[PDB]
Amino acid sequence: GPHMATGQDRVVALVDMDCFFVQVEQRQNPHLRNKPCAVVQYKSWKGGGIIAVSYEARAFGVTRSMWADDAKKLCPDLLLAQVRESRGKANLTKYREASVEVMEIMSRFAVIERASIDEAYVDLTSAVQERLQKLQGQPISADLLPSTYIEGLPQVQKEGMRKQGLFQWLDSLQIDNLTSPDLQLTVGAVIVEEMRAAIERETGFQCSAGISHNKVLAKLACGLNKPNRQTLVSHGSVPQLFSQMPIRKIRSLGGKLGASVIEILGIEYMGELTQFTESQLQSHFGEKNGSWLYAMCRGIEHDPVKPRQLPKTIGCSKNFPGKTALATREQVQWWLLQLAQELEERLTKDRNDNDRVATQLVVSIRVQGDKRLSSLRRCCALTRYDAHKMSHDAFTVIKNCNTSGTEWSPPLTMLFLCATKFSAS
DNA sequence: ATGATGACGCT
DNA sequence: AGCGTCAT
Ligand SMILES: Nc1ncnc2c1ncn2[C@@H]1O[C@H](COP(=O)(O)OP(=O)(O)OP(=O)(O)O)[C@@H](O)[C@H]1O
Ligand SMILES: [Ca+2]
């Protein structure tokens, strides 16, 4: 009772750019704005692979991973923008640079953890404290939360429902209690409105966001009202929210562990986990996983927002599917050179921008036949940012994996070069 | 014939 | 070190 921690110590947000690559291409090309459109990678095989889809095109059933030729069957008017191709591979530089635009704005408000090219977590606890002292027990106006949903409220127009729930929420806040977790989340949402307004003003890009007490709840919250909206998930909203929430929706439970929770326990929803002891969960899923599940199904998680705005590794990969699999030594060598040249370009920019140098090169390949991501990984020293040296070193490291040949057997269906172990410079 | 990339866990 | 998992 009085000694059971409730996981309400922090205010955490997750910001997620809406259909990010589409927004980048729509900013650049106004003819794509407010249209069903998608971004496509490559072109020859079935019109290319769709990597991002505007919300107008999603209404027709267009999805990521679909072939553009197939997407045109669902949406004949679909407009397409093509990812840049350099040295025979997709080049995502435009989107990485757009991501930096957004991340740099977010960093003005708080310490961020880059979670992907277009997501970042925000630890707002200190900014909320400061903003709560600048307020003098002043009530928070609904005008300060013009795109916020309060999950679980109210308890026949979309915006009308949003305001009704927001009104119910604001009407019961303990405004004079500076330590009230619900009040802290509400101020957190005010700051996130300001952060999202600044992103849109300064880049043209819209995003969604979740505000809660931890990263898992903030990420879940973000997806509840997309696009261009933000959602506050309070501690008290967790029992009803989790009571019908498929386990797979919780971050890290979308794969084999989540499937085993469902199968071993015979449950479907996150809230059903509360009926097991911590020891029971640890017995089925291990000490770390069981302790994490025991707390998480109660809305409690302690994973910190890591102060990290830059990636820890810089990598370049390309798949070679079906008949395009690399089957000669000259082929393997040329593509390792192509990847190494793009990697050198990124590394040199990274050293100038971010005052660091990578010291290890990881080479990963996939062999025709294995359903895994990688068949083999080996490392070597990375001492000079030179594409010819890196590709020669990568070959030497993987040369012995060749059965016999001028020929390369079995053929390679993936090449991957990753620079790691950065040191300041 | 998805594809590109990145974090972190386990041993 | 090298492999497996999970994610955008
Ligand atoms: N299966 C995948 N393969 C490759 N890249 C992916 C994949 N899923 C996500 N990504 C990368 O993450 C970026 C953001 O993906 P996300 O799932 O957030 O979709 P989105 O296009 O931003 O739409 P939403 O509005 O739903 O967020 C994508 O542009 C892509 O670069
Ligand atoms: Ca996104």
CATH number for position A145: 3.30.70.270
| Coil vs helix vs strand at A403 | coil
User: Is there contact between A89 and strand B, defined as CB under 7 Å from any strand atom?
Assistant: yes
Report resolution in angstroms: 1.8
d(CA A16, CA A31): 24
* Shared-domain flag, residues A121 and A263: no
| Angle ∠(A98,A99,A104) on CA atoms, nearest 5 | 105
The size of chain A, in residues, is 425
The amino acid sitting at A294 is: Y
* Shared-domain flag, residues A298 and A336: no
Cα maximum dimension of chain A: 78
Place of tokens 């059965």: A403
Are A142 and A164 in contact by the 8 Å Cβ rule? The answer is no
Cα A412 to chain centroid, rounded: 29
Beta bridge partners of A67: A49
* Shared-domain flag, residues A254 and A235: no
* Residue A58: CATH number of its domain: 3.40.1170.60
* Shared-domain flag, residues A217 and A323: no
Which distant-in-sequence residues (6+ apart) come within 8 Å of A52 by Cβ? A19, A20, A21, A22, A38, A39, A64
Are A279 and A384 in contact by the 8 Å Cβ rule? The answer is no
CA to C1' distance (Å), from A317 to B6: 12
Cα A324 to chain centroid, rounded: 30
* Residue A286: CATH number of its domain: 1.10.150.20
Q: Please say which residue of A65, A88, A111 terminates a domain.
A: A88
| Coil vs helix vs strand at A266 | coil
How was it solved?
A: X-ray
d(CA A236, CA A257): 27
* Shared-domain flag, residues A233 and A258: no
In the DSSP assignment, the letter for residue A384 is: S
* Shared-domain flag, residues A317 and A358: yes
Question: In angstroms, what CA-CA distances link A369 with A356, A374, A410, A414, A417?
Answer: 38, 11, 9, 11, 21
* Residue A385: CATH number of its domain: 3.30.1490.100
Domain enclosing residue A48, as ranges: 19-88
Cβ-in-10-Å burial (0-12, 13-18, 19+) of A78 comes to buried
* Shared-domain flag, residues A76 and A127: no
Are A200 and A192 in contact by the 8 Å Cβ rule? The answer is no
Ligand closest to CA A15: 2
Cβ-in-10-Å burial (0-12, 13-18, 19+) of A372 comes to exposed
Query: Within 7 A of a protein CB, which nucleotides of strand B?
Result: 1-10
* Shared-domain flag, residues A100 and A65: no
d(CA A3, CA A15): 33
* Shared-domain flag, residues A419 and A359: yes
Does A113 sit in the ligand 1 pocket, CB within 6 Å? no
Residue A354 CB neighbour total at 10 angstroms: 14
**A16 CA from centroid of ligand 2 (Å):** 5
Question: In angstroms, what CA-CA distances link A238 with A5, A12, A90, A125, A164?
Answer: 15, 15, 42, 20, 20
**Taking Cα atoms as reference points, which of A83, A103, A105 lies closest to residue A92?**
A83
